[PDB]
Design a protein around this nucleic acid. Structure first.
Ligand SMILES: Cc1cc2nc3c(=O)[nH]c(=O)nc-3n(C[C@H](O)[C@H](O)[C@H](O)COP(=O)(O)OP(=O)(O)OC[C@H]3O[C@@H](n4cnc5c(N)ncnc54)[C@H](O)[C@@H]3O)c2cc1C
Length: 456
DNA sequence: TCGGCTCGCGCA
DNA sequence: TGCGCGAAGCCGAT
């Protein structure tokens, strides 16, 4: 609908209707940023064509009770900064509390909205809210993919079996969809306290905090500063200092050579399209650029593909047939060790490498990418059943990862435990034909002892 | 009816 | 450390 630097394939209609005479409302959810946001840019362009202002609404749900203070504070502090940035562009933001299915519909009527726009998430709960809102409004409802470089429904029309089949489809569409962002034009027409929501939510989550023996908190909040401004700083330091060595050291957890962008990417405080634009233009090791681009383009956006075309993305049923048949055959194998959720959570296994990985997770909220594979695969090896392993890995991932509760997490766990986007490997007890990883294999790839000593 | 897929292992 | 191979099931280009 209108636009010159505005590709209409990024937007799709969720509900037809008569465009009201009120303001355009951007229901912001996944992409919590003011710059490099196609959903906010499309909302502004529609408002300009109708000579109305654009407003932003955010609904704080009860979902923060299922996680911890680490994610709540990170999100909320980012939203406080975002509120000021939108105010500088004369864009007011409204923060609601409750069920989006009820609050968003009530806000549309009470504010006499003319058009509703939201960003795109393939998670189940977002589809439920969208269906509830459609049944409660009479104005047009649009959805914009602001998170993927290529719109999820455009990159592929089906579940992609492997990255090597998805890779040519995605890269063929890069020349069309990889582009610069236009500037967010401020509003022309003029038209709950976040500090109170922060204190009320923290007081609720306090009894569930992760503590050590001295009742001292485990989480170290100084590793990652939240917000759109801090995300840009992280990206800049990655390109200048770490991108060159990324290809060689990406799988060495003793070196801080990752981009460290996932907390910002998950909450949408930075755009992956922006990161890709800057990495494309940087002059660095070609093998490092290719390796990093493959991670933030192929693997990130195939995770959205997985969740979008497999609504059981967090269940055993989503695994490929060969993996289900293999794991079913080994359900009666004696496990060398069986640990409960509580024993995994406290890092009380026999494996010091596994315990150190859990300690990095508990203390920093961001486990290194390589040890996340080892961490999840040992949960499968030392659990009663594949379903219990899946349940334990998802629980700990979403509870403690700053970047958790994310398509990348469900696809990554499904890769580790059920071979989604992987292939069959040598037959073993318990784990069957699922790709195996061993302590001795890690010892030959990086200094395992240094990683263990850093995290007790 | 093939070719090639994001481990462990033996060997420089 | 870096390389080549093994062990596995299957998509997709034909
Ligand atoms: C068991 C398991 C659980 C994971 N949990 C999550 C999760 O909850 N949330 C999450 O965003 N990712 C998760 N990952 C993927 C990956 O581990 C992290 O995205 C990565 O470590 C994030 O840190 P980084 O940004 O410094 O990594 P970088 O090496 O700098 O990669 C940059 C970005 O590329 C994407 N990316 C990288 N690796 C993957 C991958 N394997 N799959 C999909 N996208 C990827 C990410 O968006 C990432 O932020 C998980 C992977 C596994 C195997």
């Amino acid at each position: 609908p209108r636009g010159s630097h505005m590709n209409p394939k990024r937007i799709r209609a969720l509900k037809s209707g008569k465009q009201g005479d009120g303001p355009v409302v951007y229901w912001m959810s996944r992409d919590q940023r003011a710059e490099d946001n196609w959903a906010l840019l499309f909302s502004r362009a529609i408002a300009k064509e109708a000579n109305v202002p654009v407003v932003v609404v955010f609904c704080l749900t009860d979902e923060f009770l299922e996680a911890g203070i680490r994610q709540y504070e990170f999100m909320l502090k980012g939203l406080q900064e975002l509120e000021v940035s939108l105010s500088r562009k004369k864009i007011p933001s409204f923060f609601l509390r409750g069920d989006p299915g009820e609050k968003i519909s009530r806000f549309v009527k009470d504010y006499n909205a003319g058009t509703l726009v939201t960003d795109f998430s393939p998670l189940r709960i977002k589809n439920q809210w969208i269906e509830k809102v459609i049944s409660g409004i009479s104005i047009p409802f649009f959805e914009v993919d602001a998170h993927n470089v290529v719109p999820c429904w455009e990159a592929s029309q089906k579940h992609e079996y492997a990255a090597h089949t998805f890779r040519p489809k995605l890269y063929a569409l890069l020349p069309e969809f990889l582009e610069e962002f236009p500037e967010l034009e401020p509003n022309s027409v003029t038209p709950e306290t976040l500090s109170d929501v922060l204190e009320t939510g923290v007081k609720a989550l306090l009894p569930e905090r992760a503590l050590l023996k001295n009742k001292d908190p485990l989480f170290e909040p100084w590793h990652f500063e939240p917000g759109e401004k801090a995300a840009k700083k992280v990206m800049e330091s990655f390109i200048a200092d770490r991108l060159d060595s990324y290809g060689a050291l990406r799988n060495d957890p003793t070196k801080n050579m990752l981009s460290n962008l996932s907390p910002y990417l998950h909450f949408g405080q930075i755009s992956s399209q922006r990161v890709v634009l800057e990495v494309e233009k940087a002059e660095s090791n070609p093998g490092s650029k290719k390796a990093f681009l493959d991670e933030i383009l192929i693997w990130k956006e195939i995770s959205d593909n997985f969740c979008y075309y497999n609504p059981g993305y967090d269940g055993f049923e989503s695994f490929p047939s060969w993996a289900k048949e293999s794991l079913n055959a080994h359900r009666n194998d004696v496990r060398s060790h069986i640990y409960t959720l509580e024993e995994f959570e406290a890092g009380k296994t026999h494996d010091p490498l596994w315990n150190a990985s859990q300690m990095e997770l508990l203390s920093t909220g961001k486990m290194h990418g390589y040890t996340r594979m080892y961490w999840a695969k040992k949960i499968l090896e030392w659990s009663e059943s594949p379903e219990k392993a899946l349940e334990i890995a998802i629980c700990l991932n979403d509870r403690y990862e700053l970047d958790g509760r994310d398509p990348n997490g469900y696809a990554g766990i499904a890769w580790s435990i059920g071979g989604v986007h992987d292939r069959a490997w040598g037959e073993r007890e318990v784990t069957g034909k699922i790709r195996y990883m061993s302590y001795e294999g890690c010892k030959r790839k990086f200094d395992v002892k240094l990683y263990i000593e850093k995290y007790s």
